[PDB]
Structure 1
């Protein structure tokens, strides 16, 4: 089992479309009813859903937000009735310090909800977090929740889908501070999926609805095998151990109109495609640390071995000199059309990601020398006296970059 903590407008939407994808996959009706064709289903549902006496299924989700508008719109959707009104929380009434201050203020009810959800699962495995690191809501609230959660639950995993601000595009003027602080908290508490609007929209090209549909696709494909038990990799901890910051790529990212080219898609061509920097959805002979490829559809392990052999000989990849990939196979949901003969998802750890922080650090250093937009931060208690928090966070990020 698992819980999802989605914050800010970004996280709220991310959750909306993630649950849309899930209910589509598992044959869950918008109202929580189960379709007749899926009555005898074999798919495991406990992982993301828990059924109710009324036979309906409820997501293990909690909605958090500093503002009402987004969730109010969500509850006007056809999927509104599905969620649990008890879990959803809205502030009665764009800065990280303010977000953390509110988090300190509203500890009690949030952790009440979290405890209630936790006690309903026998074998909870970890946590899932969806949020954006730039905006005031996501950054600060995620920081506070991560801190108090790692404190509260020292034996549960914490996984996040953190969305990083666009850089080529000059959105949050105060983004460097929030990003740097959120990164501090991620290193200091997060167990383990980086995301950026820049490269994501780049691949989308070459509305937020479609972008986050792709993101939800990534999340669902990541959790597929856990959802669909097989032989190997039957747990999230198995995933994490096989890799341990990450980046992702998915081959069949094709529009509903781009099915006309039914290209004979082997496993070799897919696994190859997952390697190119173009497909890496995120934007010094930098090299890899780990690679995992989850493959959906018919697959012959002989083909997998041949592809691995050929790629190894062709040396299209580079590895650490000081240490000695993985190809897991799953089964598609029996419901969604198998427009793709075989499909592939890749999650990897690669040193080049360091550059991200070097940019943000460069951004942050490009402001701290002139004290820009610190007036609001001084208002909050945390930065009321000084900003030693900022210095510690910057040095922590520098240490991480040095370690990479």
Structure 2
């Protein structure tokens, strides 16, 4: 089992479309009813859903937000009735310090909800977090929740889908929020970086479609856990096989781009997952780990041949000081198999360091002139000084040095 903590407008939407994808996959009706064709289903549902006496299924989700508008719109959607009104929380009434201050203020009810959800699962495995690191809501609230959660639950995993601000496109106060959120991520987060720049780049070459792609990534990541097989039957198995990450998915094709039914082997897919173009995020930098989850018919002989050929062709580079993985799953029996075989890749690669070097460069490009610090001084945390900022910057520098 698992819980999802989505914050800010970004996280709220991310959750909306993630649950849309999930209910599509598992044959869950918009109202929580189960379709007749899926009555005898074999798919495991406990992982993301828990059924109710009324036979309806409820997501293990909690909605958090500093503002009402987004969630109010969500509850006007056809999927509104699905969520649990008890879990959803809205502030009665864009800065990280303010977000953390509110988090300190509204500890009690949030952790009440979290405890209630936790006690309903026998074998909870970890946490899932969806948020944006730039905006005031996501950054600060996620920081506070991560801190108090790592404190509260020292034996549960914490996974996040953190969305990073666009850089080629010029939050004016993004450097501070990003740097602080990164501090908290290093200091508490167990383990999926995301950026609007490269994401929209691949989308080209509304937020609805972008986050549909993101939800696709999340669902494909959690597929095998959802669909038990032989190997990789747990999230901890995933994490151990890799341990910051980046992702790529081959069949990112429009509903109109099915006309080119290209004979898609496993070799061509796994190859495509390697190119920098498909890496959805934007010094002979090299890899640390690679995982490829493959959906559809697959012959392990083909997998071995592809691995052999790629190894000989040396299209990849590895650390000199240490000695990939190809897991196979099964598609949901419901969504059309427009793709003969499909592939998702999650990897750890040193080049990601550059991200922080940019943000650090951004942050250093402001701290020398004290820009937009007036609001921060208002909050208690930065009321006296900003040693928090210095510690966070040095922590990020240490991480970059370690990479």
| Separation of aligned partners in 2, 1:33 and 1:46 | 15
Moved segments of 4+, more than 4 Å? none
Q: What displacement does 1:115 show?
A: 0.0
Shift of 1:248: 0.0
- SS of residue in 1 equivalent to 2:366: helix
The DSSP-based 3-state class of the residue aligned with 1:202 is: helix
Structure 1 residue matching 2:128: 3-state secondary structure: strand
TM-score, scaled relative to structure 2: 1.00
Deviation at 1:274, TM superposition (A): 0.0
- What is the 5 A alignment of 1:137-156? 137-156=137-156
The two structures have a TM-score, normalised by structure 1, of 1.00
Q: What do residues 52-75 of structure 1 show as CA deviations (whole Å, max 9, x unaligned)?
A: 000000000000000000000000
Q: In the TM superposition, what whole-angstrom CA distance separates every residue of 1:228-266 from its partner, at most 9, and x where no partner exists? A: 000000000000000000000000000000000000000
**1:102-129 deviation per Cα after TM superposition (whole angstroms, max 9, x unaligned):** 0000000000000000000000000000
Question: 1:368-395: CA deviations, max 9, x gaps?
Answer: 0000000000000000000000000000
SS for the counterpart of 1:249 is strand
**1:213 CA displacement:** 0.0
Q: 1:170-199: per-residue Cα shift (whole Å, max 9, x none)?
A: 0x0000000000000000000000000000
Q: Provide Cα deviations, 1:133-184, integer angstroms capped at 9, x if missing partner.
A: 00000000000000000000000000000000000000x0000000000000
Q: Residue 248 of structure 1: SS of its match in structure 2?
A: strand
Q: CA deviation at 1:203?
A: 0.0
1:308, 1:40 → 2: CA distance? Answer: 38
Secondary structure (helix, strand or coil) at the match of 2:37 reads helix
**2:122 is the counterpart of 1:122:** yes
**CA distance in structure 2 between the partners assigned to 1:264 and 1:326 by the alignment:** 24
Rounded to whole Å, the distance in 2 between the matches of 1:363 and 1:154 is 34
Q: For structure 1, which runs of at least 5 residues remain unmatched after alignment?
A: none
SS at match of 2:208: helix
RMSD: 0.0
SS of alignment partner, residue 70 of structure 2: helix
Unaligned runs of 5+ in 2: none
1:301, CA displacement in angstroms?
0.0
- Residues 197-240 of structure 1 show CA distances to partners (whole Å, capped at 9, x for unaligned) of 00000000000000000000000000000000000000000000
- Which SS does the other structure have where 1:284 is aligned? coil
1:91 is paired with a residue whose SS is: coil
SS at match of 1:240: helix
CA distance in 2, matches of 1:255, 1:187: 36
Secondary structure of 2:142's counterpart equals helix
String of CA shifts for 1:280-332, please: whole Å, max 9, x gaps. Answer: 00000000000000000000000000000000000000000000000000000
- Note the 1:172-211 alignment, pairs <5 A: 172-211=171-210
Distance 1:44 1:290 in 2: 28
Question: SS of 2:67's equivalent?
Answer: coil
Q: How many residue pairs align between the two structures?
A: 403
Whole-angstrom distance in 2 between the partners of 1:134 and 1:46: 33
Q: Secondary structure at the match of 1:389?
A: helix
Q: Distance in 2 between matches of 1:183 and 1:124?
A: 26
CA distance in structure 1 between the aligned counterparts of 2:228 and 2:130, rounded to whole angstroms: 24
Give the SS at the match of 1:162.
strand
Q: How far apart, CA to CA, are the structure 2 residues paired with 1:371 and 1:201?
A: 32
Deviation at 1:336?
A: 0.0
Superposed displacement of residue 359, structure 1: 0.0
Aligned to 1:16, what secondary structure does the other structure show? helix
What's the secondary structure of 1:383's corresponding residue? coil
The alignment status of 1:63 with 2:101, answered yes or no, reads: no
In structure 1, distance between residues paired with 2:361 and 2:52: 51
Secondary structure of the residue aligned to 2:283 is: coil
SS at structure 1 position matched to 2:353 = helix
* 3-state SS of 1:371 partner: coil
Q: 1:101: how far off?
A: 0.0
